[PDB]
Write a structure and sequence with these properties.
Layout (H helix, E strand, L loop, with lengths): L22 H17 L4 E3 L9 E5 L9 E12 L3 E6 L9 E6 L2 E6 L5 E6 L1 H14 L9
The structure holds zinc ion (ZN).
């Protein structure tokens, strides 16, 4: 099963490597990441948090209308960030019992491969832009406490 690594583990500081997409393998990884994320009431997770230093994140988007759902983002890359910043109180399953206000760009554009291997580009803002930037930071060996 996937176990979530916590601050002090050096694998949280190693940069993650690009994935060559495989639909079946990503499906398995997706299922296990979602399970780990949701079991601890998270809304994002990066592969290095579960000991896999590959460039894969998941972002919750559970709704009343459609039920539990999360986006898979393989090799996510920010191609644009707004000049405008917003402050948000962050936490992290890999940094338990710590929170704090972090300034980041309010909106971004991100490219990635989805669950099905299609190349996507989305313009994100609000909470989606926040979770994506936090999760991509994990792939660069960055924890949110580094901003303080
Ligand atoms: Zn995190």
């Amino acid at each position: 099963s996937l176990k979530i690594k916590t601050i002090g583990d050096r694998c949280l500081r190693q940069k993650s490597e690009e994935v060559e997409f495989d639909k079946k393998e990503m499906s398995e990884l997706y299922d296990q990441m979602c399970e780990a994320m949701w079991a601890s009431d998270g809304i994002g997770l990066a592969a290095p948090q579960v000991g896999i230093n590959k460039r894969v994140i998941v972002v919750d988007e559970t709704t009343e209308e459609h039920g539990k759902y999360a986006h898979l983002m393989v090799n996510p890359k920010i191609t644009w960030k707004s000049e405008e910043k917003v402050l948000f109180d962050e936490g992290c399953l890999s940094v338990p019992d710590q929170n704090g206000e972090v300034l980041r760009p309010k909106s971004i554009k991100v490219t990635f491969q989805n669950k099905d291997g299609k190349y996507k580009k989305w313009k994100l803002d609000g909470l989606a832009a926040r979770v994506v930037q936090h999760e991509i930071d994990h792939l660069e060996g960055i924890l949110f406490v580094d901003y303080f």
